[PDB]
Coordinates of C-alpha atoms and ligand atoms in Angstrom, one line a residue:
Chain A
X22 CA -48.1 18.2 -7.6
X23 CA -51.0 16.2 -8.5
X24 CA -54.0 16.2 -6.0
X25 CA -54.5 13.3 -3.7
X26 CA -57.8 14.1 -1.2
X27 CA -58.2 11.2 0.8
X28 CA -54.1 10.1 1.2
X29 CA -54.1 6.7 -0.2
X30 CA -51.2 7.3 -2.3
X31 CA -53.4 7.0 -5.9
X32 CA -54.4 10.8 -7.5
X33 CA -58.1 11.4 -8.1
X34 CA -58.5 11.5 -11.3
X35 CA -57.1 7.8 -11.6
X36 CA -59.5 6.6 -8.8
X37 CA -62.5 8.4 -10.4
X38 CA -61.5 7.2 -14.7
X39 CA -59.8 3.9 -14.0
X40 CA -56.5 2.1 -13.0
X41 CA -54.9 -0.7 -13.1
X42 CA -51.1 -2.4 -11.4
X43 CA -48.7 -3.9 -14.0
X44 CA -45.2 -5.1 -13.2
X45 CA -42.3 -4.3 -15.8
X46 CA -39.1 -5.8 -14.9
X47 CA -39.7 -6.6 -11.3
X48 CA -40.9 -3.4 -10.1
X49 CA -44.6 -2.4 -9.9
X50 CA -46.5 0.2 -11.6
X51 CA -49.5 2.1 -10.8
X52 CA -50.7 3.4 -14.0
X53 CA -53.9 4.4 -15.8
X54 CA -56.3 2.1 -18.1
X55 CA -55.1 2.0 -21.1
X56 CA -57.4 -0.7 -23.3
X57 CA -54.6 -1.3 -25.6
X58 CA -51.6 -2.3 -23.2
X59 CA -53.9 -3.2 -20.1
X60 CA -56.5 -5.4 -21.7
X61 CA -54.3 -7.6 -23.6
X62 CA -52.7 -8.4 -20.7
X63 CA -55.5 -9.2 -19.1
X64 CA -55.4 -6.8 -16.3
X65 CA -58.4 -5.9 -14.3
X66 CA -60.0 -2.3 -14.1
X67 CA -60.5 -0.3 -10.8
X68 CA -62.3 2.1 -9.8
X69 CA -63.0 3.5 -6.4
X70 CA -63.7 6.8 -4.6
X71 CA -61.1 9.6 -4.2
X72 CA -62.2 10.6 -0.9
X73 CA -62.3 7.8 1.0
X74 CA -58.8 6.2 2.2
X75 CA -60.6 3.0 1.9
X76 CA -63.4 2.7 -0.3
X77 CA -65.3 -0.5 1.2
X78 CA -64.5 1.1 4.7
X79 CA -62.5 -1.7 5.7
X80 CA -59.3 -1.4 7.4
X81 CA -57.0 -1.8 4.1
X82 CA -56.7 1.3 2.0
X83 CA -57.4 0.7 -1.9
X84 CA -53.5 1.0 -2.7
X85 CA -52.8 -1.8 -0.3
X86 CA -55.3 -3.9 -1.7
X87 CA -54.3 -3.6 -5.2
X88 CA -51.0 -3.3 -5.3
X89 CA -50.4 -6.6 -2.4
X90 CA -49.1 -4.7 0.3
X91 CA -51.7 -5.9 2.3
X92 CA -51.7 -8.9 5.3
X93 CA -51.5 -12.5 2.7
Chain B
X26 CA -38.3 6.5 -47.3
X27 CA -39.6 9.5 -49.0
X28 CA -42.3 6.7 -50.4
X29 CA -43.8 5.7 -46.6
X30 CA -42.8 9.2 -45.2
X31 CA -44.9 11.2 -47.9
X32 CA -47.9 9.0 -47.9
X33 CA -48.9 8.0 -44.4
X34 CA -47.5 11.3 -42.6
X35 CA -50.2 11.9 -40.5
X36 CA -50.0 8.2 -38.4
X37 CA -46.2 10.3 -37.4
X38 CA -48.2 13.1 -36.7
X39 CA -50.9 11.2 -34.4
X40 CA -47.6 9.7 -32.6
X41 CA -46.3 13.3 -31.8
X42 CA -49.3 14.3 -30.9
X43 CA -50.6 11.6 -29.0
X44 CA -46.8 11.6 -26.9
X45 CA -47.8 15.2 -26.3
X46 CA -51.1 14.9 -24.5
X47 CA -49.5 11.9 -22.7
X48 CA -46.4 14.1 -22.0
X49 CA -48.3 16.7 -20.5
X50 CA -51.5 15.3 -18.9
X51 CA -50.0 15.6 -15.3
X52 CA -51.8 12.3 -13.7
X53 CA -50.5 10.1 -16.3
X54 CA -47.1 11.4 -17.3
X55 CA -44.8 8.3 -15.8
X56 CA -46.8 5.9 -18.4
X57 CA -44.0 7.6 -21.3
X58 CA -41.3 7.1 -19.1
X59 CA -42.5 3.7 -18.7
X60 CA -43.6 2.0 -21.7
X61 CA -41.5 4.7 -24.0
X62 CA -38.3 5.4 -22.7
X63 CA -37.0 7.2 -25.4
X64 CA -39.9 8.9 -26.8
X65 CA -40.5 10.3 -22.7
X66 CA -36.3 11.2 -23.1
X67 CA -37.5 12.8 -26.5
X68 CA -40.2 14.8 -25.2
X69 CA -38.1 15.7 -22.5
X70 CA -35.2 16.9 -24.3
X71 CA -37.8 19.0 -26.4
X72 CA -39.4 20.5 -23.6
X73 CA -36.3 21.5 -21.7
X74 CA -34.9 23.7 -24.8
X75 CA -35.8 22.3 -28.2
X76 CA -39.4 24.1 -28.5
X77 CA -37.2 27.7 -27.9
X78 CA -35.1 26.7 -30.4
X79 CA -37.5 26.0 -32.7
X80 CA -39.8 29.5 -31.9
X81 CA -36.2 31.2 -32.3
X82 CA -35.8 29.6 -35.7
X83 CA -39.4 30.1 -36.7
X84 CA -38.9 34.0 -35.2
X85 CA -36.1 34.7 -37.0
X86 CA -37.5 34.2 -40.0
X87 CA -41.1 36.0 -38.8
X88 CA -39.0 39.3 -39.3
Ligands
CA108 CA1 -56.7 9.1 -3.7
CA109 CA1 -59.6 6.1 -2.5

């Protein structure tokens, strides 16, 4: 598999390089930063720690908060 | 045609190469099967069989 430290649901390597969340048909995507798809889309570019479940230490992991599954 | 297929050959070659890396660079593998269907079905196909057929046809003729 592909390593995941602090259980958040997005690998390490994408926390530590950059991420983004685009939506195809109707179904959402996490996927890398790619500067030709991603940034004329407009998509914004995350980056966050791969160790800590939530990175600002708040009570909403960083999957959650980017991805909407979060209280509205 | 033989015209754009003999002068611009290596833009095919950076596409093959470039599906390679993005085939087998484990974090982002699911970005192919996204955005590229076909060329992740491609790659797939390839990887499940087609490169031993191709070593067997290259190996055949090493002898
Ligand atoms: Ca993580
Ligand atoms: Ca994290």
């Amino acid at each position: 598999t592909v390593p995941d430290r602090d259980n958040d649901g997005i690998p390490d390597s994408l926390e530590v390089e950059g991420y983004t969340v685009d939506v195809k048909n109707k179904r959402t995507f996490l996927s890398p930063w790619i500067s030709n798809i991603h940034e004329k889309k407009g998509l914004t570019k995350y980056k966050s720690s791969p160790e800590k479940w939530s990175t600002a230490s708040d009570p909403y992991s960083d999957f959650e908060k980017v991805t909407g599954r979060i209280d509205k | 045609d033989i015209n754009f297929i003999k002068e611009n050959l290596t833009e095919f070659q950076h596409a093959f190469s470039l599906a390679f890396s993005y085939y087998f660079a484990p974090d982002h593998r699911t970005v192919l099967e996204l955005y590229a269907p076909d060329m992740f079905e491609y790659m797939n196909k390839l990887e499940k069989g087609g490169f031993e057929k191709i070593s067997e046809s290259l190996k055949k003729e090493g002898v």
